[PDB]
Copies of this chain bind each other. A is one copy, B any other.
Amino acid sequence: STTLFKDFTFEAAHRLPHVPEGHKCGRLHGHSFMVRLEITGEVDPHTGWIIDFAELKAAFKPTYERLDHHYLNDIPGLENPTSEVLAKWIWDQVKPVVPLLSAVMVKETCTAGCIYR
């Protein structure tokens, strides 16, 4: 009934393979992505934390490193790297290392994002 969240940003290149022929999103293009990891459980009586942040950064780092300053399409499972797919992919990578993960949000621009539960 308490939730935490943490934002990270990464710089990346991608393109959408399944859009019609002219579409601007089929060009190779890039963005400053924002990812929000959201976490839900009990507040620890001694530490007063649901989770240490240094834990959360450590458990995300392997996945973060694959995304940042990379080309998304070269990453297995991101063959079609829209926000929807990216956020599912991210959940799939993070959830088995962060059991208390309750949601992933991805934002490609400042005016548009996607949330996966």
Which residues of A does B touch, CB under 8 Å? 1-9, 11-16, 18-19, 24-25, 27-32, 43, 46-50, 53, 68-71, 80-85, 87-88, 108-117
Interchain nearest-CB distance for A67 vs B (Å): 10
Nearest chain-B residue to A50 (Cβ)?
B84
Known A9-B110, A85-B43, A112-B53; judge A70-B27 contact (CB<8 A). Answer: yes
For residue A107, give the distance in angstroms from its CB to the closest CB of chain B. Answer: 9
With beta carbons under 8 angstroms apart, the residue of B14, B111, B113 that contacts A30 is B14
Given the contacts A48-B82, A82-B49, A113 and B4 also touching, CB distance less than 8 Å? yes
Q: With A and B bound together, what is the CA distance between A87 and B67 in angstroms?
A: 27
In the assembled complex, the CB of A116 is this many whole angstroms from the nearest CB of chain B, namely: 5
A19 and B47 contact, CB distance less than 8 A:
yes
